Write a protein that binds this ligand. Sequence first.
Ligand SMILES: Nc1ncnc2c1ncn2[C@@H]1O[C@H](COP(=O)(O)OP(=O)(O)O)[C@@H](O)[C@H]1O
Ligand SMILES: [Zn+2]
Lengths: 105, 506, 536, 210
Amino acid sequence: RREERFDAYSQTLGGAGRFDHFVEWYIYLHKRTVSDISSSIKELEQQVNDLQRTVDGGMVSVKSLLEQMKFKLSEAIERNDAVLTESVQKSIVEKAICSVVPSIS
Amino acid sequence: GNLLSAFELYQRNVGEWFEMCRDYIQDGHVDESGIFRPDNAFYLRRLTLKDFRRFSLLEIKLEEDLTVIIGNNGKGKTSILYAIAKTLSWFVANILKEGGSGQRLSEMTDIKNDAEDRYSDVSSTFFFGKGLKSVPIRLSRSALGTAERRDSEVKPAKDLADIWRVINEVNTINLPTFALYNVERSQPRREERFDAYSQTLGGAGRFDHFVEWYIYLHKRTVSSSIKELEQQVNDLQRTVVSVKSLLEQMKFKLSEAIERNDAAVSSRVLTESVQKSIVEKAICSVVPSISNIWVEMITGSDLVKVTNDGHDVTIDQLSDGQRVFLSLVADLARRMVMLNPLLENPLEGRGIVLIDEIELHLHPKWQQEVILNLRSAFPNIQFIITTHSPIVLSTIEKRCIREFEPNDDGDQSFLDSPDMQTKGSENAQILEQVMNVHSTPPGIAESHWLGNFELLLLDNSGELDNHSQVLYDQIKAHFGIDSIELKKADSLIRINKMKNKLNKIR
Amino acid sequence: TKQYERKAKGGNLLSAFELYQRNSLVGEWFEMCRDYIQDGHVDESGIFRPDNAFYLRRLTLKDFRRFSLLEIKLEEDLTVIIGNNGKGKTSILYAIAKTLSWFVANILKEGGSGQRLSEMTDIKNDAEDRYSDVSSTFFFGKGLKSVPIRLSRSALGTAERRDSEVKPAKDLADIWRVINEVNTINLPTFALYNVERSQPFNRNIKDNTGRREERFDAYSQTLGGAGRFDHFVEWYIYLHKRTVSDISSSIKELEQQVNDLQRTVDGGMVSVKSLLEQMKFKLSEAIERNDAAVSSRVLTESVQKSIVEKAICSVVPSISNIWVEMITGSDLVKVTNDGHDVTIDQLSDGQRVFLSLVADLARRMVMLNPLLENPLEGRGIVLIDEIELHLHPKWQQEVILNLRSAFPNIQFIITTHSPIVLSTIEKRCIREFEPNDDGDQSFLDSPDMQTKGSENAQILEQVMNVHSTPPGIAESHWLGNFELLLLDNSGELDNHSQVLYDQIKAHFGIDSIELKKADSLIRINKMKNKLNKIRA
Amino acid sequence: MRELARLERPEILDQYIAGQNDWMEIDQSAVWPKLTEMQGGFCAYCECRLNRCHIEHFRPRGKFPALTFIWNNLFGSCGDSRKSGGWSRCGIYKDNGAGAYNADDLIKPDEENPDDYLLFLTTGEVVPAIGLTGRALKKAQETIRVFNLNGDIKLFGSRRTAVQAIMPNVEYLYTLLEEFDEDDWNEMLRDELEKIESDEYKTALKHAWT
Ligand SMILES: Nc1ncnc2c1ncn2[C@@H]1O[C@H](COP(=O)(O)OP(=O)(O)O)[C@@H](O)[C@H]1O
Ligand SMILES: [Zn+2]
């Protein structure tokens, strides 16, 4: 299992790393972060807020999308509300990669 | 209302004849039960086998809805299904491609080993409404090293398949489903309409394919004019960090809409959301003890979950029997949805489905349920199935059953229905009357003790002598004090004592 | 020492062997070990019975897969595991197979390793102790009443390692290996037949390198789950070729060629000396192989052939004969199936799969038991998953009896969901596997009802919890409803009871069991009522 | 198997003579009504209800061509010779399946009472009667073998089931012996034994009752 802590020692001195294990682990982290409703609520709240600002700025074409997202947010809030360590882990790694690898933002 | 004549006139020339052909294929009605019924049904009516494998000559008439073939090991039940599948391969090949070639009989294995005339024939007659009452096809093969080769006669199959192909090319129509599910089902680019015919007559109904497909459909259906969508994409692009995920989703939706718009009539298809829903309902309707199926991603892996007997479990917690059956139904439903886009319920489409050993890996409990709902879910499919299970036969009408006699030397001309009604009958009766098996094992000594006990009672004028007492004690010791066998013995004692008393009161 | 001498003279096998190893009275101790393994008697039925039987007595699973703790006692002859939950039944057979791998490895090679438990799949997910154990106890006569083996595995990063304890199994396997090396003995057969055994037949059969003739090829892939029916076919064709050929004719021909070549070298043709030396080497090798074959105390190829043919024909009902045809310069195995001569690839799937099982097992037994009059009376443990796979009811009624007749000293551990199979087995041999929702169970129960010789309808209801009639069919309830209506109307046919009677008659027919039962009910209730009126 | 009462020689058998005529010539529908009057629409040997049926020569036309249009030789057996399917008892089995037999070592049910030789156990096996030796035993043994009266599973099962259905009614009658007077109880048993003339496997049911 890629989320098991001692998997960090798996083929660690083999010479190539395990970039395949990274990708699997990162997708895992993503799925867990998406699935927790509060971050999804926070993300949805942020999306609703961004869409509301666009509608207030004169773009009447996105009003239908705002109403859909507001409904999704209300539903998410209604569904049983509970910070994920998985979300933080994901952020740390993303920042490391972006800081060290020049071409990747 | 001759379909071939109408089509020939269409090919030579024009709108009227096209419409007549299209209406012949597409017209139907909804019956009193709310089920769509095609006006022109398509099914296999008759099959004849000559010097094929074990059969010197065999003729079978099939039911429009369900035919169940039963017999001992090596009676040729699988041979029959193989013969049909090879015939059906000619329809599939010609629906896909003009002048496509179907499969052929093996010169090494399929000719009967002691056939004096060294060739084999598989003759099938299909029905397609009153306009086309008889579509005869013959597959033939001569043995290896014979001077004279015998020709297969496949033009009628090609002609009919041509009508489906050509009419579909001009205007989308519903197409027939052909599938074979053999015993191998148990062994461990975007989607396009005619993928429904890929590996339909061998390789179908594998669990891993389902799971992969199902998860894929779920991911796509997690979260509508092109111009409106183009405008929304443009507006979202101008706004673009938190809205980037939404932009990518909308770009995908736009691309899909353009693709659907660009895609041809001949490949036109139901939305992924609808497809998913139909398959889910099919599974839950057909499969014993599954009430719900869904994809979770909350633990971090993609898991298919099911509600099995009221408990939510992972699909890997299902028995192998349930997995194999789930896979069969899911596969069939998938193909039906792809081939019947114009129907309100795509599972009410036409077709012929062959299933070998339907009870494969099923516990008796589920054997009692499997056929019940299959015909309700797929009302216009002709099912031809093989089984060894009296439990399965207890759910089926005798008219659907075709039995090989136990002493069949492979010369017999017909397969026939059993004399007893099987539907609703006791399994012990089906075993003896239909499957020619004793309800108790004759090779076990204890199976004869009650008979022997009775004979001893009758030899000693009904009185329990030393010998009868010993055997009684053996019965009691072996079967137990509460056993049906002991109760029968007790009954025999009581009756015989009373009979003897009467005899003495002369 | 004197203590070992006393225990050895008392009949302790390990003590006798230790004395043998240290002194290598060395001949006496060797003979004692050999006699312990080889001694047996022919019983009243004419069947050879080893004095010292070998079988698995007990199995315990701790934090293994779904099981927190599970204990199973096994029968010396036949144990059948039943239950709906088929992914647990298979786990039990897998656990046994891994344990048996340790015997096989050590019979083949000193310090051979069997199979380990997986850290990923074999440890229960919510195990507090984060390790798994598979503990087995074997029996080998009164001299060795308990041979314990434990396979263990701990999770990564635990503070203590949990190692396997396998020395007793290795010690026993070493006795078999070492004694056999000195003087040929009979060896135990271990085999696993999973649902994998149902696989299609590759017809195009491979060139005999000559691994198949080696005695310990009998242990090749023996616990892999499929058997090796391909290996059987190769071996069987090989046996045929050797039977048609003369023995040492190649040696005689080679002897003649070496004699002719020797005459040429004596006649002054020194250029052919290199060829003579090569041919002399070939002759010596052929003699050695012949001598080794002679030294290996093996049965003649003709006899081996006969044994296997008889076994197959006895166990597999549809097969009356099996033979090798030499036609179109390619050897084919043919069978007489249901009175007709066919190739193996022409057999039905049910027949082929079962043939494959029996053929494989028989081949291995013949190879491992060369000193027995009937090699199929050898010792061993055989595991079979889903024995009813592809079998009609008629075969289900005979399969266990046929297997036990052909292999009378094998311990069979099998799984089934067939009531028909259960009707041929004693309740003591049956173990029922009803887990909780979490999969866990502590003990496996024998059923309360005796199954052997019982009606299949009773086994369905009493053991498998399935009704005699399908509950989802209305007609299945009509006779019950009819009885209820009779009882409600003081045993007179009212309009409602008559309608239902007519429906029963119309649906099931005039000579149906159902109608006869209805008629019986009418007649008995009429007679009860007449009695009641007489009393009034 | 029942004791049969043959009486009337039918008209059409006088016209055809053996040697000159062949059996296939005859109108078989002329023969049936008197066999149906004799046997009561049941088989001669097993006592099934007839639906697939044929005219059976007790001594066969191959072995005994003189006995061909003789009224004593004819019986209504179950099963159909023509139909594309196996039948494995009674007439068809005697000829095909049974193989070698002496015709003198069979119970002819019109000549003899079969109740002296055969016994039907309530388990639905037919056995030789209690206390037989020599020729009488050899008749009982061969009649069971040649008509296949236990080997046919369909027959064995059908008979066993028929009897098992009435064994509640048998046990309950013989309990009420105690309380009832003789003349009324004898009427009860006479009533039950009258009913089973309409029933299938009547001899096997008789032995359960008597
Ligand atoms: N070419 C052949 N000639 C004669 N018999 C054959 C030939 N091929 C197969 N058979 C016979 O056909 C039977 C296999 O038919 P199959 O359909 O597999 O049976 P099942 O009903 O058990 O599925 C076997 O009895 C086999 O001997
Ligand atoms: Zn009869």
